[PDB]
Paper text:
In the order Corynebacteriales, which includes the important pathogens Mycobacterium tuberculosis and Corynebacterium diphtheriae, the most important murein hydrolase for cell separation is the endopeptidase RipA. We present here the crystal structure of a full-length RipA homologue from Corynebacterium glutamicum, Cg1735, which reveals an unusual mode of autoinhibition. We describe how this autoinhibition is relieved by the conserved transmembrane protein Cg1604 and propose an FtsEX-independent model for septal control of PG hydrolysis via the Cg1604–Cg1735 complex. In this model, two septal TM proteins, Cg1603, with a cytoplasmic N-terminal globular core, and Cg1604, with a C-terminal globular core exposed to the cell envelope, form a signaling complex that couples intracellular cell division events with PG hydrolysis during the last stages of cell separation.
We thus produced the soluble periplasmic domain of Cg1604 (Cg1603 has no extra-cytoplasmic globular domain) and assessed its effect on a PG activity assay of full-length Cg1735. A clear activation effect is observed upon addition of the Cg1604 periplasmic domain to the reaction mixture. To elucidate the activation mechanism, we solved the crystal structure of the periplasmic domain of Cg1604 (residues 36 to 295) by SAD techniques at 2 Å resolution. The structure revealed an extended N-terminal α-helix that connects the N-terminal TM region of the protein (absent in the construct) to a globular domain consisting of a parallel five-stranded β-sheet surrounded by α-helices on both sides. This domain displays the (β/α)5 topology characteristic of receiver domains from bacterial response regulators, except for the insertion of a helical subdomain between β-strands 2 and 3. The globular core of Cg1604 has no obvious groove or pocket that might suggest a putative functional site. However, a patch of surface residues within the subdomain insertion (in the membrane distal face of the protein) is highly conserved in Cg1604 homologs, suggesting that this region might represent a functionally conserved binding site. Indeed, calculations with AlphaFold on the two full-length proteins, Cg1735 and Cg1604, predicted with a relatively high confidence that the Cg1604 subdomain interacts with the CC1 domain of RipA, to form a complex in which the protein–protein interface is highly conserved in both proteins. The crystal structure of monomeric Cg1604 does indeed rule out a putative channel-forming property of the protein. The best crystals of selenomethionine-derived Cg1604 (35 mg/mL) were obtained after 22 d in 30% (w/v) PEG 4 K, 0.2 M MgCl2, 0.1 M TRIS pH 8.5.
Numbering used by the authors: 46 to 293
The structure:
């Protein structure tokens, strides 16, 4: 008799599921579709980012008409104390021409963001790439060879906006250094023009989390868009809308 109740459960919830998909389809068409036509957007993802969050945001960017400028995974060593010294050395030795590392802020996030920003972004006033294809390949390959980043060969293009998708870390315990370095990294990318959207799950909005740190700084809160609920439907939509805000 238990096959009857499983049948009613499927009947009741299949109606609810179809209703939810219809709502979401309508939202995509009215909010996201066609809003980023021919705009190159690059996606960065931290090591602890949920793959569903990254795949969902990447799908919505494609639905908006954005050009897939590449997906770059920032491995654990990218934001760890252990890897700070070698990361600063790599970005210094492969620094593209026309890029200058900060002489007052010597943290790995600022330097890595200044170097990667020049390698991956377009001049927001002229549209020209900030670095040559050879300079971009050098930095990306040296970073990848040393285990700092992961990406697929020949899929990276210079973009107008970077969407960094983070995890669900509140910046407590040993996650503190990474959370702070991520915020300085995001501000450095934004300081190279163009535009940055940082998206994470709710715990990143803690005062010690990456988004909490960004929002607490008046300059960063005005310059870097932050989405604290990227695992929610409207959080994904707000991320895509924020890309168009950063472009304006
Ligand atoms: Ca900005």
């Amino acid at each position: 008799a238990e096959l009857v109740e499983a049948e009613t459960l499927a009947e009741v919830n299949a109606v609810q599921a179809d209703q939810a998909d219809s709502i979401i389809d309508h939202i995509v068409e009215d909010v996201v579709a066609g809003t980023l036509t021919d705009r190159p957007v690059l996606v960065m993802r931290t090591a602890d980012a949920e793959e569903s969050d990254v795949a969902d945001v990447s799908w919505l960017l494609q639905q908006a008409g954005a050009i897939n400028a590449g997906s770059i995974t920032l491995e654990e060593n990218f934001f760890s104390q252990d890897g700070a010294d070698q990361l600063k050395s790599i970005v210094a030795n492969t620094l593209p021409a026309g890029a200058q590392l900060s002489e007052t802020q010597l943290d790995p996030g600022t330097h890595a963001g200044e170097a990667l920003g020049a390698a991956l972004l377009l001049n927001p006033e002229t549209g020209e790439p900030l670095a040559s294809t050879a300079e971009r390949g050098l930095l990306l390959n040296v970073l990848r060879d040393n285990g700092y980043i992961s990406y697929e060969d020949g899929t990276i293009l210079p973009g107008q906006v970077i969407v960094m998708i983070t995890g669900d870390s509140d910046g407590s315990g040993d996650g503190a250094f990474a959370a702070e370095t991520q915020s300085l990294f995001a501000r450095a990318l934004d300081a190279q023009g163009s535009g940055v959207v940082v998206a994470g799950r709710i715990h990143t909005a803690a005062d010690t989390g990456v988004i909490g740190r960004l929002r607490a700084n008046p300059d960063a809160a005005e310059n870097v868009s932050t989405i604290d609920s990227v695992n929610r439907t409207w959080g994904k939509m707000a991320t895509v809308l924020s890309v168009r805000e950063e472009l304006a």
